[PDB]
Amino acid sequence: VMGEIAPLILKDEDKSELLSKNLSHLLGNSDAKPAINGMREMTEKLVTVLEELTM
DNA sequence: GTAGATCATGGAATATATCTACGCGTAGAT
């Protein structure tokens, strides 16, 4: 996640400095929950980034 | 001689989306 999805999701940060963090900084584990499979904004951007990465 | 018993004597207005306070589960740091 922080290797590839984070730089495309987190727009303005140092990617190497992003490589040494916790998943919640970009996923938002305060919410998290199986609700990521729903229609939430982070789900939207994650799906967009995944679809762009693998075309 | 008298008192009691006997006999005579008689026409025609409801449900729902929204605002707000609180505990709190988890995230972050080390």
Side-chain angles (χ1 to χ4, degrees):
Chain A
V1 157
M2 301 67 68
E4 310 294 340
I5 307 85
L8 313 183
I9 294 274
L10 312 163
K11 235 41 189 179
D12 43 80
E13 300 80 1
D14 182 306
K15 53 102 196 167
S16 34
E17 172 265 339
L18 293 177
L19 302 189
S20 56
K21 289 180 170 186
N22 179 300
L23 194 59
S24 151
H25 66 317
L26 92 165
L27 175 290
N29 277 347
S30 50
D31 284 343
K33 283 165 187 177
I36 300 136
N37 302 341
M39 61 285 297
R40 208 139 67 263
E41 38 271 47
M42 323 147 280
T43 297
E44 181 33 80
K45 38 175 202 52
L46 171 57
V47 161
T48 305
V49 159
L50 185 38
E51 278 192 353
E52 158 268 1
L53 275 168
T54 68
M55 42 301 299

